[PDB]
Amino acid sequence: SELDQLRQEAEQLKNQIRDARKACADATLSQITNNIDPVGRIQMRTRRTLRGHLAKIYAMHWGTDSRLLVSASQDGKLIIWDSYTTNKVHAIPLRSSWVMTCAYAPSGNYVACGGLDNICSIYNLKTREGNVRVSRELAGHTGYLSCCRFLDDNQIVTSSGDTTCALWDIETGQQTTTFTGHTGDVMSLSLAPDTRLFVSGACDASAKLWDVREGMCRQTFTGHESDINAICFFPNGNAFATGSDDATCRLFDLRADQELMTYSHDNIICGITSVSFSKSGRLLLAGYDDFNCNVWDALKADRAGVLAGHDNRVSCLGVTDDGMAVATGSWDSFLKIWN
Amino acid sequence: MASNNTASIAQARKLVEQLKMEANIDRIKVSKAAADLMAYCEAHAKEDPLLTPVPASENPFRE
Amino acid sequence: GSVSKWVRLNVGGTYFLTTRQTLCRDPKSFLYRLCQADPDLDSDKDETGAYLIDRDPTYFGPVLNYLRHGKLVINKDLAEEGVLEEAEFYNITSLIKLVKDKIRERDSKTSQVPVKHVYRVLQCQEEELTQMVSTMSDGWKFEQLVSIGSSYNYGNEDQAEFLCVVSKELHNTPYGTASEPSEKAKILQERGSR
Amino acid sequence: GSVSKWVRLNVGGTYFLTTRQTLCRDPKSFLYRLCQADPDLDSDKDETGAYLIDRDPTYFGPVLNYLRHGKLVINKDLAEEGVLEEAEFYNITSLIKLVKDKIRERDSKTSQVPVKHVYRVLQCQEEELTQMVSTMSDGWKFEQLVSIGSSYNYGNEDQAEFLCVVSKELHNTPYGTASEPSEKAKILQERGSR
Amino acid sequence: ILGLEGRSVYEEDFEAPFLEMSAEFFQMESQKFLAENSASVYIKKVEARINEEIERVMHCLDKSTEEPIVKVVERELISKHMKTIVEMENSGLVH
Known part of the structure; x- marks a missing residue:
């Protein structure tokens, strides 16, 4: 029928995208401009060890004020830490088991936790009394939800299984803005500081940048051939680092529509499991799923430093909103703060 | 429609449409984006506390 | 007719x-x-x-x-x-x-005849204990607080001085239907197992 | 007809x-x-x-x-x-x-009314503890956790440090039985008693 | 209904012969009209024939299909005879 003609049209359109990218592919000044001094040797110290978890810590997420992070440990418990005093502000018992994503609200008055139960639990951090009560059990996900970030206090997307990312109206509780088009279980979900474009990394190894109003795949970055684990936007919203099961972290850029830079070690076989940018975005903190994390220069791809000291893999990284310290939600059931 | 191999046409149609404006959108040189990133990073290197030895008093992590 | x-x-x-x-x-x-x-x-x-x-x-x-x-x-x-x-x-x-919907509501509100429950442990230092105990979630029932000894600071005021253990009369197994197994869920499950 | x-x-x-x-x-x-x-x-x-x-x-x-x-x-x-x-x-x-099957399912749910509860004891070190507490067999209940001091791997982190009792209600869901005349079962029961 | 949305099969089976015969017949009809009689009454005759044929095609066939058929019929009728009409036997546009 019409499959062949549309297949050929898509082929030529994709080739046009490829030609536009390669034509506008100039030499990346970054490695060329090594006359700019390197980041040298900077090694952070663990100022605080947040040893308040027994189960493995899956997701950590700093708050909007960068003092109240939320961590989820796999047994099913959320701990909102106070990182300045190592005292738990809350410890939420979650009905969900196998929680992989916890997200802090822009207001800092809600937390979104997602497990394999296919329910995005939206817990109110503060109710009128003062206890922690579930605001909304967002149900209606085809698969499990892998990651999620609040667009608003009644808007949130949920990078879920079965190729969906639909934005949910929290007030009504039904999915509102569909984001289908992926071909793998959409694991990652990164919001730009502009919050009008979110890039989602799935098991198809293609990072799909979606426009959050119209709801179609604004850009479709490719270059990974292994499932994308974590995506971290640059503090400007023009570029993002992407990690995967390969030891290569790809710094992609929206302007060039293609990868600018690589951070790869042939001496490391561990998959890049977490990516994070510092306050300036000059440091690329490479979370490795062996037992420890590294940090590269996001403009030279040399060894900025290594944060080791965990006896089990660092499953997630987080950076303060002033970039002044980095917390490592690891699988040794500790959240270590490195200043 | 379901006689064209059970609605397989719609996905290809959507792919073509979504490739259209991706072809249309502005393209920028790699060197320009790289230089922009260096400019922002160097301008903010001082105010990124990782790059600078933090004194014993200012941070809530040596407080 | x-x-x-x-x-x-x-x-x-x-x-x-x-x-x-x-x-x-x-x-x-x-x-x-x-x-x-x-x-x-x-x-x-x-x-x-x-x-x-x-x-x-x-x-x-x-x-x-x-x-x-x-x-x-x-x-x-x-x-x-x-x-x-x-x-x-x-x-x-x-x-x-x-x-x-009514069947699921009935099972959620009443499936404790086969005693279907969910249990969690929430380690907490003695100090913030009253906070998260008092502010403990609505609908969850506190079940047992268990002291854990230590050799840290004369054994007291360690970051882990207690294990709170709470439960929930709800369950995540089907009220008639629930989230059903899938291959990628199994992949992540065995990934977390190791 | x-x-x-x-x-x-x-x-x-x-x-x-x-x-x-x-x-x-x-x-x-x-x-x-x-x-x-x-x-x-x-x-x-x-x-x-x-x-x-x-x-x-x-x-x-x-x-x-x-x-x-x-x-x-x-x-x-x-x-x-x-x-x-x-x-x-x-x-x-x-x-x-x-x-x-339906009758025996119902009667299992009403054998609960007589004081009939099946109890079990599990042993756990502090790390693994919550993992069984969370992913414990559906249809049972947590009942007690006791910390017993240890000198083999002193105190915390010892396997024999924590004892967790669990229980459910006695049931006869597919059927209940009061005796098996097979001799070898009795021989093994006598052997395993002491 | 066998297509269920499928234009191609119906066009191959019915629409194409219909288009070809209508185009050829209306082309020769316009030619013989222009030959036999002057321009204005020629226009009136082709318009009246269009009315009759369009009503019959209306009842004969579904609305969604006729519009391409009528447009090509008119294009054959008028556009092909663009130049002849301007200076035509008996009376033309310059006349």
Whole structure:
């Protein structure tokens, strides 16, 4: 029928995208401009060890004020830490088991936790009394939800299984803005500081940048051939680092529509499991799923430093909103703060 | 429609449409984006506390 | 016969006197096929003419309740499963959906006869204990606080001085249905196992 | 039975006008033979021309429901045992087996009322603890956690540091048994006692 | 309905012969009209024939299909005879 003609049209359109990218592919000044001094040797110290978890810590997420992070440990418990005093502000018992994503609200008055139960639990951090009560059990996900970030206090997307990312109206509780088009279980979900474009990394190894109003795949970055684990936007919203099961972290850029830079070690076989940018975005903190994390220069791809000291893999990284310290939600059931 | 191999046409149609404006959108040189990133990073290197030895008093992590 | 102002449906051999427009609720119902005239029936009483339909009359009670009176409230001596199964026969998707919702609600509010519960442990240092104990989640029941000794700071005021253990009368296993297993969920599960 | 496909029975004085096909679902059925002519059958009522089945219609309802539509739902006020006993009189084996399963499921849920609780003890070190507490077998309950001091791997992190009692309610869901006359089982019981 | 949305099969089976015959017949009809009679009454005759044929095609075929058929019929009728009409036997546009 019409499959062949549309297949050929898509082929030529994709080739046009490829030609536009390669034509506008100039030499990346970054490695060329090594006359700019390197980041040298900077090694952070663990100022605080947040040893308040027994189960493995899956997701950590700093708050909007960068003092109240939320961590989820796999047994099913959320701990909102106070990182300045190592005292738990809350410890939420979650009905969900196998929680992989916890997200802090822009207001800092809600937390979104997602497990394999296919329910995005939206817990109110503060109710009128003062206890922690579930605001909304967002149900209606085809698969499990892998990651999620609040667009608003009644808007949130949920990078879920079965190729969906639909934005949910929290007030009504039904999915509102569909984001289908992926071909793998959409694991990652990164919001730009502009919050009008979110890039989602799935098991198809293609990072799909979606426009959050119209709801179609604004850009479709490719270059990974292994499932994308974590995506971290640059503090400007023009570029993002992407990690995967390969030891290569790809710094992609929206302007060039293609990868600018690589951070790869042939001496490391561990998959890049977490990516994070510092306050300036000059440091690329490479979370490795062996037992420890590294940090590269996001403009030279040399060894900025290594944060080791965990006896089990660092499953997630987080950076303060002033970039002044980095917390490592690891699988040794500790959240270590490195200043 | 379901006689064209059970609605397989719609996905290809959507792919073509979504490739259209991706072809249309502005393209920028790699060197320009790289230089922009260096400019922002160097301008903010001082105010990124990782790059600078933090004194014993200012941070809530040596407080 | 095919059309009458009121029709006597012999459900289970028992008369239900129902008016047409209520049966006219959903086109895909069997009742709609009874309302319309296109002779393919030969089944009825051979002395009155009342259409004998071989179905349960008992659960047609709630079925016709929903049909003729909009909303469904079942008799609390009739098991909701029969209501769903009889609704399947008369093919009304809205009532089937609402019955599934009611079954899930019933199991969530009451499935503690087979004692279905969820248990969590929440280690907490003695100091912030009162905070998260008092502010503990609504709907969860505190079950046991257990001290844990230490050799840290004369054994007291360690970051782990207690293990709170709470429960939840709800369960994540199906109330009738739940999240079903999938291959990628198994992949992540065994990934977390190691 | 060679006339009136909608054959009319007088089960417990109740005129059940049922099709031959439903009854002929399971020929293992006493009624399947009534669907056909046979000379020994001389059980009839000459006041209505309908044959006699001197069994109550109160439990004939669910039996006829299952036999008509391959599934039954008993009311929450009607005895499952009565449906069962009416069931073998027509000799439908699968129906009887399913009703036996339902009956034993119900009785397991009412053996809870007698003071009958199955208790178990698990051992755990501090790290693994919550993992079993969270992913523990569904349908049981947490009851007690006791920390017992250790000198082998002193105190915390020892496997024998924590003892977790759990329990559920005694059940006879597929069946209950009070003894097994097999000798070797008794020999092994005596051996394993001491 | 066999297509269920499928224009191609119906066009191959019916629409294409219909288009070709209508185009050829109306082309020769316009030619013989222009030959036999003057311009204005020629226009009136072709318009009246269009009315009759369009009504019959209306009842004969579904609305969604006729619009391409009518447009090509008119294009054959008028556009092909663009130049002849301007200076035509008896009376033309310059006349």
